Symmetry: D2
Subunit: 449 residues, 4 copies
Amino acid sequence: TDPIMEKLNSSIAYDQRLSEVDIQGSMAYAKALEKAGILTKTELEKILSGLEKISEEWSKGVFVVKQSDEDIHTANERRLKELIGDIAGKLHTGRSRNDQVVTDLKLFMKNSLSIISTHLLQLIKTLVERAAIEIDVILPGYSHLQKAQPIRWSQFLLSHAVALTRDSERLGEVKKRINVLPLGSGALAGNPLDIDREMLRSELEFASISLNSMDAISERDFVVEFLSFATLLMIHLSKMAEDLIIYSTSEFGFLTLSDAFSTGSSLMPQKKNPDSLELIRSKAGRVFGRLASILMVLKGLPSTYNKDLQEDKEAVFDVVDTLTAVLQVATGVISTLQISKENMEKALTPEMLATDLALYLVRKGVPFRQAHTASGKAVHLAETKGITINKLSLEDLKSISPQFSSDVSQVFNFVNSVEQYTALAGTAKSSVTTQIEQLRELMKKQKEQ
Amino acid sequence: TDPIMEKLNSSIAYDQRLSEVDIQGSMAYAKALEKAGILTKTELEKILSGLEKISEEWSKGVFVVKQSDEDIHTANERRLKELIGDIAGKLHTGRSRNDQVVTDLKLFMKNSLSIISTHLLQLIKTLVERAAIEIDVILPGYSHLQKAQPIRWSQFLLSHAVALTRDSERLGEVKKRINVLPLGSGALAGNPLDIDREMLRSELEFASISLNSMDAISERDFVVEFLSFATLLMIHLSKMAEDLIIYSTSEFGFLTLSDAFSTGSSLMPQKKNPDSLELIRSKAGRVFGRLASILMVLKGLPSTYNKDLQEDKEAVFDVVDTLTAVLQVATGVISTLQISKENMEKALTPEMLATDLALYLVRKGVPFRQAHTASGKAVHLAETKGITINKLSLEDLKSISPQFSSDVSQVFNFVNSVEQYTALAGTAKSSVTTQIEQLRELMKKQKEQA
Amino acid sequence: TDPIMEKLNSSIAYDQRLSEVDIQGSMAYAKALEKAGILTKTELEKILSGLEKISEEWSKGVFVVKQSDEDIHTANERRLKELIGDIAGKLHTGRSRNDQVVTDLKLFMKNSLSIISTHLLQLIKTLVERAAIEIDVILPGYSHLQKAQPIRWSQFLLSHAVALTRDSERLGEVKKRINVLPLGSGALAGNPLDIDREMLRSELEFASISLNSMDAISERDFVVEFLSFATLLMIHLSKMAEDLIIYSTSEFGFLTLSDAFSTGSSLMPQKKNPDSLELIRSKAGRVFGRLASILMVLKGLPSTYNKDLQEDKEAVFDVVDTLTAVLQVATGVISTLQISKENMEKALTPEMLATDLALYLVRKGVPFRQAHTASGKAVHLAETKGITINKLSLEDLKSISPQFSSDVSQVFNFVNSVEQYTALAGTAKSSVTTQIEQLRELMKKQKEQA
Amino acid sequence: TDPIMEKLNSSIAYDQRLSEVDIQGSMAYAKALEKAGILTKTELEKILSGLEKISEEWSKGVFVVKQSDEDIHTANERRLKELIGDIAGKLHTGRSRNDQVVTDLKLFMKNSLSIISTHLLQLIKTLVERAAIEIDVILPGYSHLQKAQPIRWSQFLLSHAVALTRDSERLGEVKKRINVLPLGSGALAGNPLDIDREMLRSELEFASISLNSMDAISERDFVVEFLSFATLLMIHLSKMAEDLIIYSTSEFGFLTLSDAFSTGSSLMPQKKNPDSLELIRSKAGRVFGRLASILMVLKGLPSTYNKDLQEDKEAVFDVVDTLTAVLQVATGVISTLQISKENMEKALTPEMLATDLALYLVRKGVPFRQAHTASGKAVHLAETKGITINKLSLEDLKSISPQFSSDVSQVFNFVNSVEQYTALAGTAKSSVTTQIEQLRELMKKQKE
């Protein structure tokens, strides 16, 4: 076999993290083989004993990988033979690399997803708890990156938290389909020894078992779904990062990241470069790239198994490692950044209340169009008088519309502004309080899984 | 405004299919404005009556679009004003194009996914039912596009059906999240007039309402996951297409597509080009392209609303139409194609039973490796005698292993070969029958989801 | 035969813009057929005459598409036989839809690329001219969206013009490979009539002719690389858009877009939303999506022709139209935006000069590390005294290093700062002037080559 | 600084292959710094001497990376100080990791592209030599994976070599824009010491120098282009792989890969799995993913430098190694595969000559449509008689059309079939010979 090919087929450099799941797969199959009469009870106890030793060797970090090992599967097999001899060979009876490999990857992903979920719920909790605490802070809401209308800082934080919860929800749906046992599919047509797949399922703790052997061997839906979930999660993180990066500019001056998540220069110690957010933003492309690669790998392949499917591992390991690191950095960032309440408030300008002025008339019965026209005239009048709209006198306003009463002075207050949004999902305090409670409830339910 | 700029902001060219859901959204909002005391009952009646006439105008295809109409939303309000005058203007009180547009897209998508669900289930049902009927057919199973081991044709059909049921399940999940009311989120901070959102949900028939206004206005998760579901579904269809394209070659000779789903030449009337399968395969790229575009459009955008989000509609419409056509063509192809039981059985060779010969020894207590070696010797001895392994004598067999008895004759039978796989998911008849039943129940449960 | 199938094969709805190039390909082929003797010198005159009439019909929007016309070709074929009778049938002799279609697309792409080229070079020229005019404007140069060091506003504009000139260079390279005649490749094995491909090349104005019939029929390299060129150009435009969108925020306050390329509400007359820039940014994803789709369509297809290749037209047309519109809008944006020199200069702070304070020491022979430390100490001493570094007394500076002399005052000047960068391509005035010259020269070379 | 943060910011784990180019960049800069009066002649000698020793340490795989080393640049910096002391610190005067990093990546890519060019040209040459020698072989040409019309096996092999020759042309275009010196761009605004960039260009052997410092520092066009070229090249190898996989099925029986590039079972010793071709086919997705990631990384980023740009390296390294391995495996596969002339031969059937029968009439003045209808009648007839088209008697033929003369027999010959395509680019032997000469001339020029 060609040396370059042999090099392209090696995966020991990156698949060793499958050590433990590979062993659990073999212990379960060994027990199954014993039930099918392929192994005697004595042979079983010997194999299970050996496999257990191997497990403690990897766990203790004393397992020794040898140059001949082309992949984790061969490394474990060699080691089993070294410990117990020929008897070890009976372990492959009726089993194929085809069903043993997807079994290891799914078990690995299930464990990986549980860890990812934890870090994800922690990020969501951090935003929600921070929103509750800073619920009185108010700043500009933006559209087209232009100041549109006053909003509570907590409404901004919660919008990200809510998107992240849908990610957490997709994570749970993906895990459900991953939690299906493919072992017992053999190489293509099924397991030829009437192996007890229910025993395998129970032993490995999957929720159910695969419906069709050909599908179970060749489908990589679980890889794609995971990569899709990962990519959308990264899109959300890239948006939050873009926001924070812009809000942390000296021009905006709304917040500052902690030294732990930013870099600087002794020459300009006052300026902090948002490295952590740029890292997070850049990973969206890295993760999207993996999703794109696997989709093209799978596109147009014929049934059943084909070597092309081997590209799955590196893509999954990369995304798992990337998400684990970025979610934690994100939590650290949100948890430790410092907001400048002063600057957020100073960014609120009277010009941003002209819509509320029109809304003031709408509530008194003035038709939408009129109310808008009256507010336009107020803005123009302030202009000509050289002042801002919150400074026009009652007489100035009455000159535009009799509908303006002295209470219109309540319009010119940023708390009264955000407090008009009591309709569900709005930025009024009660609405924000309601979201925090809905999110805490959602997190509980997703934690219970 | 700049003429090229104007053209770039025009969606009227393709967004007219939203005319109906736009009107319904407006009717619901009109009613909520009345409850909020923004409209009188008299005003509500006049607005609703006008919206109804516009709906009819679109329906009867008599609506007249004016060169001044930038988009469907502008066309409808223009027409409503023409019909009922000044009063039409109050309808937009507290509403934004921002929450109005996402509302129309989700309403459109919900109706669209309902139709796609129906075609997807019909495709799965066609695969499952043909599999029950052709359950006795046996043909080669392939790995690396090389004959591996005998399998039932139905096992092959069912592998695709199973994959498509997961697609169906994903569709169900996407639909749940699309079925959430975004109306009443206003331009960014929410609806400013204490609008009754529960009422909006009731009128528009959504299952729940959006939790956060900024999110509801800026997220396009629903477009992305619909495109993800669509792309994975296309991968499955592209694989089934590739299989069928190869099996329809004169070289394999396994099946032939009907005339309705293929093309031919009057110079070679016996040959058929699998056009339908090629189009289906090609749509995987087309659909994937939309998924890729929307992910890039969304990446790095700041909160909250930005014009970039307008790229959503064309991608959704293209994929909705692509899946609808593709799923129906796939159903027709699977339904009408003709298999050659003769060519499929013919492809089954004795060499394909060497594995079964090893398993024969395994079951008689011979260790895995020794059994494999034993079968290899037999394969080799047959090669030397210029005969197929099923022609070796019992005595020749015993010379390789005393574990070979006269019943080894049972190994050289393709029905017996496939019948070995009785473990759940296998190709044995009882396993296939169990799959058919499981899928029938799954389709029942999924069809009930709606 | 199937209804859904036929709809999927219909392209007349979008491929009509290929009307004229299809007729040109036909005229050139007719002529070659006469030379080969397939058409008498008389039939030729009648076929060419019938073609010029069809050309005229489309040219006047007079043409009428029948409900039976599945594509532009079939429409032109129907119209010719319908104009000159049976004779129009001899035109397909030896020709195939396979080599006829790629010929039409390449001709179309060649004309479209010359147009894109003009709009692209115009954008580049606009950036360069504006750089020449506003060469005295200085503002902060950013990294990590944090102020790093002073730069000339012109250096920023030229950084974008330089990237675009590479796109222009790539465009020319793509045009060269598109400028190769595929006609005469037949359906797969070539043309069976020994047609004069040199005549076809000369008549249709291609630079050379395709080397292999199978490759010419099956490759879509030209589509892929046109789309790659377009995606990278869009990446460049998405970056310029992002910068300008940020610079136009009220927070930065560096520039304002003209009314033609932005939108605003009467309620906040001073607010301008950068619509043009957002649309441009959003097209990066739309274009990337097309590239993504064609790559996926081509992946794993076997030789030679397959119906999958039909997805090429829609991806090309969308990107051709997108680029033509986007490039012109970008030109208008750059040409008409208004900068605030005052706000740009006011953003320059003394803290941005500590690096220059270190360089001051380095030029007096102090090692890099010691100079950096001394500047860091001065920065810190100022911080503790609650003053800016340009306000530290010489005595204070000498307490940090005796090497700081009275002439250190010159360090705290922003013109002096940008003027240190005389090395080729830096921001000093002479360097920026040199860049303008090289660009002017590059644009002339590319205009002259196009 | 946060530990997960530190791990993410660290590139040392993978950027070490830039060790030698990083050193070359430093040697060139050191030289220009001496000319600029920043370094004395002795300091220069000491710095160049230390840099050479470091080059040797890496070449001998004896270099010691320390826990504190964040990247290759910091590692070499640390090592030089260890070897020559305080003066090592003068080397970074006016330089930034921003212009240093792109200089190293371009130098590395320039070298990697020369290696890829070598393997790509060898693949093309291998296809061409094989097409020259198996020039008499004829088999079906396919459309929709259905037998369409006879063609020479060489025409098939050459269709792949032609597309690859365009990949080779693109590679040259990408290499030219990469061969532009970015060093001396500083961190953003340029080099602040009037460094002699022409001297840096000459020492590092670049063809020219970057035009604008901000562009030079922030653009990764060269990465995208390389990725675009690599992806299209993989598309091409993707198709070739798909073709060979199908042709290697027992159903087609056209060829069989050698043991070195396939796998098999002792249980079925006569069947070979073309895993070399499947590996090649799957790498298209691997490479496309890298292109997609970098495009997404760059989209929407503002000027000038941003940390996001650090994703460029791993994508480039993966694609360089993938292409290098895949190109050589493809060369071996084409060079060592065994074709079955007999089976390609048997694959040719009379049914595939009906279009030819129609052209035969066409060359006799009979109109396009009528000649077609005519061949169709000959086909229908032979069908009713249960015979192949080439068995029909001249009277059976004439009864359909008087234009059929005994010379119509020459039509039912597959060599005569492929010989009709003499027009440039066709499958006739003369055209195949011409293509072979044209490609050899192209490679000669692309090589020089």
